[PDB]
mmCIF file of all heavy atoms in Angstrom:
data_model
loop_
_atom_site.group_PDB
_atom_site.id
_atom_site.type_symbol
_atom_site.label_atom_id
_atom_site.label_comp_id
_atom_site.label_asym_id
_atom_site.label_seq_id
_atom_site.Cartn_x
_atom_site.Cartn_y
_atom_site.Cartn_z
ATOM 1 N N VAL L 7 79.995 88.034 106.861
ATOM 2 C CA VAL L 7 80.976 89.087 106.962
ATOM 3 C C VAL L 7 80.351 90.329 107.565
ATOM 4 O O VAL L 7 80.944 90.994 108.416
ATOM 5 C CB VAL L 7 81.589 89.364 105.568
ATOM 6 C CG1 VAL L 7 82.408 90.645 105.547
ATOM 7 C CG2 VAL L 7 82.427 88.166 105.155
ATOM 8 N N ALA L 8 79.145 90.628 107.127
ATOM 9 C CA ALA L 8 78.419 91.777 107.624
ATOM 10 C C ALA L 8 77.627 91.464 108.907
ATOM 11 O O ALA L 8 77.322 92.376 109.676
ATOM 12 C CB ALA L 8 77.494 92.272 106.536
ATOM 13 N N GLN L 9 77.265 90.196 109.132
ATOM 14 C CA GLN L 9 76.484 89.842 110.312
ATOM 15 C C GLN L 9 76.851 88.465 110.842
ATOM 16 O O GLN L 9 76.939 87.501 110.082
ATOM 17 C CB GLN L 9 74.989 89.856 109.986
ATOM 18 C CG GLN L 9 74.569 90.982 109.060
ATOM 19 C CD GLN L 9 73.065 91.183 109.038
ATOM 20 O OE1 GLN L 9 72.542 92.103 109.667
ATOM 21 N NE2 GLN L 9 72.359 90.321 108.316
ATOM 22 N N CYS L 10 77.038 88.370 112.150
ATOM 23 C CA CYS L 10 77.366 87.103 112.784
ATOM 24 C C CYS L 10 76.083 86.356 113.130
ATOM 25 O O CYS L 10 75.702 86.266 114.296
ATOM 26 C CB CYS L 10 78.191 87.351 114.047
ATOM 27 S SG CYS L 10 79.044 85.884 114.693
ATOM 28 N N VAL L 11 75.413 85.827 112.108
ATOM 29 C CA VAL L 11 74.172 85.101 112.314
ATOM 30 C C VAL L 11 74.447 83.674 112.773
ATOM 31 O O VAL L 11 75.578 83.193 112.694
ATOM 32 C CB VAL L 11 73.276 85.094 111.052
ATOM 33 C CG1 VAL L 11 72.378 86.311 111.045
ATOM 34 C CG2 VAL L 11 74.091 85.036 109.770
ATOM 35 N N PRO L 12 73.422 82.991 113.297
ATOM 36 C CA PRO L 12 73.557 81.625 113.815
ATOM 37 C C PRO L 12 73.852 80.583 112.746
ATOM 38 O O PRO L 12 74.389 79.516 113.045
ATOM 39 C CB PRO L 12 72.198 81.341 114.475
ATOM 40 C CG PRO L 12 71.509 82.663 114.572
ATOM 41 C CD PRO L 12 72.058 83.509 113.460
ATOM 42 N N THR L 13 73.504 80.883 111.507
ATOM 43 C CA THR L 13 73.747 79.949 110.419
ATOM 44 C C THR L 13 75.187 80.022 109.953
ATOM 45 O O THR L 13 75.694 79.105 109.305
ATOM 46 C CB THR L 13 72.807 80.243 109.253
ATOM 47 O OG1 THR L 13 72.673 81.641 109.052
ATOM 48 C CG2 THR L 13 71.419 79.677 109.448
ATOM 49 N N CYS L 14 75.829 81.133 110.253
ATOM 50 C CA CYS L 14 77.192 81.349 109.836
ATOM 51 C C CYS L 14 78.198 80.482 110.577
ATOM 52 O O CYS L 14 78.073 80.249 111.778
ATOM 53 C CB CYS L 14 77.531 82.801 110.057
ATOM 54 S SG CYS L 14 76.814 83.882 108.794
ATOM 55 N N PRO L 15 79.260 80.050 109.867
ATOM 56 C CA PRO L 15 80.339 79.277 110.464
ATOM 57 C C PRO L 15 81.081 80.152 111.454
ATOM 58 O O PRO L 15 81.375 81.316 111.181
ATOM 59 C CB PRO L 15 81.207 78.910 109.262
ATOM 60 C CG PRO L 15 80.988 80.019 108.328
ATOM 61 C CD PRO L 15 79.537 80.348 108.449
ATOM 62 N N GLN L 16 81.323 79.599 112.620
ATOM 63 C CA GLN L 16 81.971 80.319 113.702
ATOM 64 C C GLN L 16 83.309 80.893 113.284
ATOM 65 O O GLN L 16 83.703 81.963 113.746
ATOM 66 C CB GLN L 16 82.133 79.398 114.921
ATOM 67 C CG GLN L 16 82.623 80.108 116.169
ATOM 68 C CD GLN L 16 81.500 80.645 117.041
ATOM 69 O OE1 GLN L 16 81.623 81.718 117.633
ATOM 70 N NE2 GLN L 16 80.399 79.904 117.134
ATOM 71 N N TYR L 17 84.020 80.175 112.439
ATOM 72 C CA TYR L 17 85.329 80.625 112.008
ATOM 73 C C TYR L 17 85.255 81.800 111.050
ATOM 74 O O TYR L 17 86.260 82.478 110.825
ATOM 75 C CB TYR L 17 86.144 79.482 111.403
ATOM 76 C CG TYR L 17 85.408 78.631 110.386
ATOM 77 C CD1 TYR L 17 85.339 79.011 109.049
ATOM 78 C CD2 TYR L 17 84.838 77.421 110.756
ATOM 79 C CE1 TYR L 17 84.716 78.211 108.107
ATOM 80 C CE2 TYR L 17 84.221 76.609 109.822
ATOM 81 C CZ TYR L 17 84.162 77.008 108.499
ATOM 82 O OH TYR L 17 83.549 76.202 107.568
ATOM 83 N N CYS L 18 84.087 82.065 110.491
ATOM 84 C CA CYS L 18 83.961 83.189 109.575
ATOM 85 C C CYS L 18 83.463 84.444 110.287
ATOM 86 O O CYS L 18 83.592 85.550 109.763
ATOM 87 C CB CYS L 18 83.026 82.835 108.439
ATOM 88 S SG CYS L 18 83.636 81.489 107.377
ATOM 89 N N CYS L 19 82.892 84.277 111.478
ATOM 90 C CA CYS L 19 82.381 85.423 112.233
ATOM 91 C C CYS L 19 83.517 86.382 112.569
ATOM 92 O O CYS L 19 84.522 85.973 113.152
ATOM 93 C CB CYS L 19 81.672 84.987 113.517
ATOM 94 S SG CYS L 19 81.004 86.363 114.498
#
Side-chain angles (χ1 to χ4, degrees):
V7 168
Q9 321 195 102
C10 196
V11 272
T13 41
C14 283
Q16 188 90 217
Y17 47 85
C18 296
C19 180

